[PDB]
């Protein structure tokens, strides 16, 4: 029920698919149980995106909760808008005895509006104990832009704070700065982990993923070996990186020979696992390629050694 708010809600309501209309509209709380029956969710897309936004016209929707709608949309569509991983680092001392979600919301919004005075920061403390910050940016010269927001999934007391790599503007060093000063840390470092599957980045940065008689195969002693070495490097249930696992090679050919390798698969760490047994790869499959989760890194910048 406002400029860049009502039509913003319209643009985020045609984004959400028809199946999970109830799921996202129930969680953002503006449509109570009585309001759900008024609109027939099963009829049409333009019908619902017109009646629902009217149901907020009577509900006088504001950007503070319109952005929360976008948050809840992305919580089920986090597998888009490839995510950078920021890693905080406190120095020597005790941990953050005060991460009050109210205090963190204050210490983040205050620092962000200290310089980026026109931003619509909207938090959503999820049930997995990970505040799902969404930031619509805009300098003092412009209104906060909700067209391209920068969602930041900060796990509540974790040194790691995922970030939607939207545009990587001059706010990115302020995104990390506000993040590391709201949560009582000192150094913000981009881990350089950049994947589209946040549910896999969560696994990686937390190490949370692993916790006939006639056909005489003459190279059976080699197939057994290659299967063995592909089970002590890729143990069980690898997580889908699905990311351009770059290897910006700077090595001499055996002065350097610059390369910018980009492994690109819908499911990378499983694609590598089925390489050596398929004959494409050697059995010891180059730890540069096996230690993507073990190093918690895929955007490599290797050199010679």
């Amino acid at each position: 029920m406002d400029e860049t708010v009502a039509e913003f809600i319209k643009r985020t309501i045609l984004k959400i698919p028809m199946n999970e209309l109830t799921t996202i509209l129930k969680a953002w709380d503006f449509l109570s149980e009585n309001q759900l029956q008024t609109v027939n969710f099963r009829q049409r897309k333009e019908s619902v995106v017109q009646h629902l936004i009217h149901l907020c016209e009577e509900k006088r929707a504001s950007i503070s909760d319109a952005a929360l709608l976008d948050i809840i949309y992305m919580q089920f569509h986090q597998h888009q808008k490839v995510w950078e991983v920021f890693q905080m680092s406190k120095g020597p001392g005790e941990d953050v005895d005060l991460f009050d979600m109210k205090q963190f919301k204050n210490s983040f919004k205050k620092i962000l509006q200290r310089a980026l005075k026109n931003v619509t920061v909207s938090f959503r403390e999820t049930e997995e104990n990970a505040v799902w910050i969404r930031i619509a940016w805009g300098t003092q010269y412009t209104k906060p832009n909700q067209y391209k927001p920068t969602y930041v999934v900060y796990y509540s007391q974790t040194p790691y704070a995922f970030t939607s790599s939207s545009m990587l503007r001059r706010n990115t060093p302020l995104l990390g700065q506000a993040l590391t000063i709201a949560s009582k840390h000192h150094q913000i470092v981009k881990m350089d982990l950049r994947s589209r599957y946040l549910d896999s980045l969560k696994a990686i940065v937390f190490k949370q993923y692993n916790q006939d008689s006639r056909i005489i195969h003459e190279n059976i002693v080699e197939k057994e070996r290659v299967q063995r070495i592909t089970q002590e490097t890729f143990g069980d249930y690898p997580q889908p990186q699905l990311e351009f696992a770059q290897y910006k090679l700077e090595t001499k050919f055996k002065e350097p020979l610059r390369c910018l390798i980009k492994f690109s698969s819908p499911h990378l760490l499983e694609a590598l696992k089925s390489l050596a047994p398929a004959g494409i790869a050697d059995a010891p499959l180059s730890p540069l390629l096996t230690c993507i989760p073990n190093k918690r890194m895929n955007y490599f910048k290797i050199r010679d050694k």
Binding site: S286, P287, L288, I302, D304
Partner: peptide, 5 residues
């Protein structure tokens, strides 16, 4: 080393 073999 940085296993560049």
């Amino acid at each position: 080393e940085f296993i560049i073999d």
